[PDB]
Design a protein around this ligand. Sequence first.
Ligand SMILES: COC(=O)c1cnc(Nc2cnc(C#N)cn2)cc1NC[C@H]1CNCCO1
Length: 258
Amino acid sequence: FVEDWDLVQTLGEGAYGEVQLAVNRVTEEAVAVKIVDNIKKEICINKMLNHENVVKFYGHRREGNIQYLFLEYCSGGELFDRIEPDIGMPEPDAQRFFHQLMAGVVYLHGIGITHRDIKPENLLLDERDNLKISDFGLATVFRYNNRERLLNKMCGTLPYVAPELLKRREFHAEPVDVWSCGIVLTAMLAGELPWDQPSDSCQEYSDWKEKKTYLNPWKKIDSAPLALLHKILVENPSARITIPDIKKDRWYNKPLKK
Ligand SMILES: COC(=O)c1cnc(Nc2cnc(C#N)cn2)cc1NC[C@H]1CNCCO1
């Protein structure tokens, strides 16, 4: 009876379908079942993945039109629900989550995979509050046989997308994921998103380029994390800080405690 799973509740909703909690009849092990009525690519990319900061993939099954993906149930839920609106979270918690996010992103980039939709809704927490990158539906290969391929498709979520995606025909994948991580860090530290989108027409984006850090959400952020944000949220993706450099940042290396 070890192959029998009971559907307990609906965890969340996606565009394709639902994410349901399934519990094994014999072992009581929990799995998050992603139901999709491309999907072939999400499966292929998931089979590649093996990291402590990436949602585990257990397998998949196709029944008629319906496709089931068996994924890690992260009982701590979304990082999204740990961010208090207009407040954020304690700086040592945000730093620990950021460290984990960098470890997961380094891993993906290392294997030539770009997530392309990093946001707090996609960053799940296990039973010990360990961050796991989730949903590879928008993910793609940006490096293969040691040759980088430039991206051109418009995707992600506007508050989190890098400005080059809106202005350039082609762009490097890695600075785009770095930028979205910066936005996630801003959200964790201020409990708000800095702009609707990083465009010339967006007043809040213009204010940031004009270094008006006396305005929210920047005024809520301590100078050390803010100095890192200055490095990440750089309009030119070629001048933007790289992850190896982020790991050398003063705040990234600052010992913090409750
Ligand atoms: C209290 O535990 C939860 O809420 C919860 C746990 N584990 C999940 N696991 C996975 C794993 N992989 C994928 C993919 N793709 C999706 N959800 C999902 C969960 N909630 C569903 C949310 C997740 N954020 C997007 C919207 O629905």
